[PDB]
């Protein structure tokens, strides 16, 4: 399972649409995009619901 994380930290002018839609890199099951927690969120202790 290939996962591309922290999708809120991308370069200005860019998008991961063709990467996550299994178009830039051909994969059998494609990718699943999540956003993990940065160091600020690590310090803030973000829970499951939020």
């Amino acid at each position: 399972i290939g996962v591309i994380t922290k999708l809120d930290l991308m370069d200005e002018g860019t998008d991961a649409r063709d990467v996550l839609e299994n178009k830039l890199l051909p994969l059998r099951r494609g990718y699943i995009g999540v956003v993990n927690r940065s160091q600020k969120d690590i310090d803030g202790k973000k829970d499951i619901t939020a």
């Binding site: 370069d11 002018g13 860019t14 998008d15 830039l24």
Partner: protein, 50 residues
């Protein structure tokens, strides 16, 4: 570092190959190529595009 914008970059792989820059001290500031012998460029944008 040069001071003028004439070298590409971008999303995905764009900055791929450096330039063969042979700087020669002369009076007139211009540019010439191996594959464009007979033609002289004065703009680095023209250099970048070709």
């Amino acid at each position: 570092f040069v001071g003028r914008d004439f070298l590409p970059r971008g999303s995905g792989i764009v900055t791929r190959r450096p330039l063969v820059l042979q700087l020669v001290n002369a009076t007139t500031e211009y540019a010439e190529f191996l594959h464009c012998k007979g033609k002289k460029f004065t703009d680095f944008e023209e250099v970048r595009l070709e």
